[PDB]
């Protein structure tokens, strides 16, 4: 009586149940694991807070309306302030982590709409100015708020044009990245497990984000007659196999 459909994920002191899942994706078919010695470089023993950092943090909720263009969060940024995960983050020189991402959106059998939930490794954004204008730090570190693709261009911020993925590629091809759809008629959640993907064994958690999670409405939300025209979307994310190394004074970052 197991269905692909019902699932339970327990991680730390927190549990999620979905009764309307559509399997789960594990990026590149690899599950998060700690850093092996053969791959290690820094000689420091690392710190593995385990259950105090590897639990589920639910970010603040978004509201899908007929005019929504899509939202974008960066990792580990989105979690920069969650509990002890965040403290560890500002206090060590280097850290490394994988995540379980669970995006939630329920409706009824009269609604229609379909969101794309995708994880993009190394999502370098484009400046809407063109040329070689850079995208300032603050703009690519929105924190739990994430970036709202239907917000206005700002100065020093990225471009927010959806048919171009914020980088000069077409929305249609985002499907080459680990992703899952939430089609109100099928699905009510999306779950993706992200292994740590980098060109170095461990890195800085503040100067470099290693994935952007993106939720994009593709088939517009259509509510039943005289229904309220909107649904909330909630994102809950859990660091998994986290390791921190090179402890010290506590980083100070712009803004």
């Amino acid at each position: 009586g197991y269905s692909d459909r019902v699932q339970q994920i327990t991680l730390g002191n927190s549990t999620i149940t979905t009764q309307e899942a559509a399997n789960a994706v594990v990026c590149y078919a690899e599950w998060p694991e700690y850093l092996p010695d053969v791959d290690a470089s820094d000689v420091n023993k690392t710190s593995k807070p385990d259950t105090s950092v590897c639990r589920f943090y639910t970010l603040d909720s978004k509201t899908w309306t007929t005019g929504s263009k899509g939202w974008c969060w960066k990792l580990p940024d989105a979690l920069k302030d969650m509990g002890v995960f965040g403290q560890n983050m500002f206090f060590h020189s280097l850290g490394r982590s994988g995540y379980t991402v669970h995006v939630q959106c329920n409706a009824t059998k009269f609604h229609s709409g379909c969101l794309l939930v995708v994880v993009i490794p190394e999502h370098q954004l484009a400046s809407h100015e063109g040329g070689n204008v850079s995208v300032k730090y603050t703009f690519t570190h929105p924190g739990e708020r994430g970036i709202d693709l239907s917000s206005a261009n700002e100065v020093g911020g990225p471009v927010k044009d959806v048919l171009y993925n914020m980088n000069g590629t077409l929305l249609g091809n985002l499907l080459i990245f680990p992703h899952q759809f939430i089609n109100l008629r099928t699905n009510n959640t999306a779950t993706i497990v992200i292994p740590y993907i980098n060109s170095v064994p461990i890195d800085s958690m503040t100067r470099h984000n290693n994935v952007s999670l993106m939720v994009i409405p593709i088939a517009p939300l259509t509510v039943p007659t005289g229904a309220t025209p909107s649904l909330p979307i909630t994102v809950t994310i859990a660091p998994m196999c986290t390791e921190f190394s090179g402890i010290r004074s506590k980083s100070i970052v712009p803004q």
Partner: protein, 40 residues
Amino acid sequence: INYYKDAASTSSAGQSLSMDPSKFTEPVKDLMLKGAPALN
């Protein structure tokens, strides 16, 4: 025959002949069998 000492100096590599699209085409956690229902 390599005439040179360093590995960078050798010619192109030879075909992976690796080929396994499943990391890209089927990264699902619970295995899906073709023919069985997608969602049970």
